[PDB]
Structure 1
């Protein structure tokens, strides 16, 4: 039951639950990406840390959504978290490309929820999504695109050398 629910549609409530699942799935994907780069036969620790920090960010996104669900008087419903799409993630550009695909899919889900909010005349969604979700997503995707461009520039020259240099000189330690 809820004594507080007001102007909160069943459609939005369901979309929010779906988005929680998407963020948690993304977090899981990033966990797998991070540990792949920590393999002794891959050993690019800056990439390990980059993806692990993304896993944390996506889990935090999911938690923000769940907190909002309860604030509005909606009810969290969890579904299975499907395993990541790959067991091994190939080269650094392969992984960065996969990350961008993943982020674009999350962004589209956010765009769809924003549209739904407008269609349902639910202006709280405007405050909720605009900064911590939509703006963060635009910023993250820009950073990922920038990273992809740098690694592509580097591996065009020499692949092994390029991947090492990117990990040492772009990624944080």
Structure 2
């Protein structure tokens, strides 16, 4: 029961529970990515740190959604967390491509829930996503795109390596 629920549709409540699952699955995927890069035969500790930090950010996003579900009077429901899609993640370029696909999927789930909230005339839900999630995703996807371009630059060629070093070491 709840004595607080007001203007909070059953459709939003259930979509919030699905989005918590998506963010906890993404956290799990980033935990697997992180520990893969800590393998002695892979040994890229900054790439491990990058993904382990993202694991923490996705768990915190799930926790914020769960706090909001209770603030609105909905009821958290948990489902199983699917294991990540790979057991080994390839090169840094493979891993960063998998990470941008994952973030694009989270961003589309946020936009779909925003559209539901707008259809349901739920401005608290719409502002919650705008304030705490939509720009976080735009900023992260921009960073990951910049990283993809620099990984390819570096692995690709002499001119690319040189251009990267000039930026990093002179400018």
Category of TM-score, reference length = shorter chain: over 0.9
Please state whether the residue corresponding to 1:75 is helix, strand or coil. Answer: coil
Shift in CA distance, 48/129, structure 1 to aligned 2, threshold 3 Å: same
Instruction: Tell me, in whole angstroms, the C-alpha distance in 2 between the residues paired with 1:165 and 1:42.
Output: 23
Bigger-Rg structure (1/2): 2
Instruction: Tell me, in whole angstroms, the C-alpha distance in 2 between the residues paired with 1:97 and 1:70.
Output: 35
Please state whether the residue corresponding to 1:65 is helix, strand or coil. Answer: helix
Shift of 1:39: 0.2
Range 138-147 or range 122-131, more displaced: 122-131
Partner of 1:119: 119
Instruction: Give the structure-1-normalised TM-score.
Output: 0.91
Shift in CA distance, 38/73, structure 1 to aligned 2, threshold 3 Å: same
Shift of 1:76: 0.1
Shift in CA distance, 44/167, structure 1 to aligned 2, threshold 3 Å: farther
Of structures 1 and 2, the one scoring higher in RCO (CA 8 A, sep 6+) is 1
Q: Deviations over 1:11-34 (max 9, x none)?
A: 000000000000000000000000
Instruction: Give the structure-2-normalised TM-score.
Output: 0.92
CA RMSD of aligned residues (A): 3.3
Instruction: Tell me, in whole angstroms, the C-alpha distance in 1 between the residues paired with 2:116 and 2:88.
Output: 36
Structure 2 portions without partners, runs of 5+: none
Instruction: Tell me, in whole angstroms, the C-alpha distance in 1 between the residues paired with 2:87 and 2:164.
Output: 22
How many residues are aligned here? 171
Shift of 1:136: 0.1
Structure 1 portions without partners, runs of 5+: none
Partner of 1:162: 162
Shift of 1:132: 1.5
Shift of 1:166: 13
Contact kept in structure 2, 1:13 and 1:75, CA below 8 Å:
yes
Contact kept in structure 1, 2:154 and 2:160, CA below 8 Å:
no
Partner of 1:130: 130
Shift of 1:165: 9.0
Shift of 1:126: 2.2
Shift in CA distance, 163/19, structure 1 to aligned 2, threshold 3 Å: farther
Q: Deviations over 1:19-71 (max 9, x none)?
A: 00000000000000000000000000000000000000000000000000000
Shift of 1:145: 0.5
Shift of 1:127: 1.9
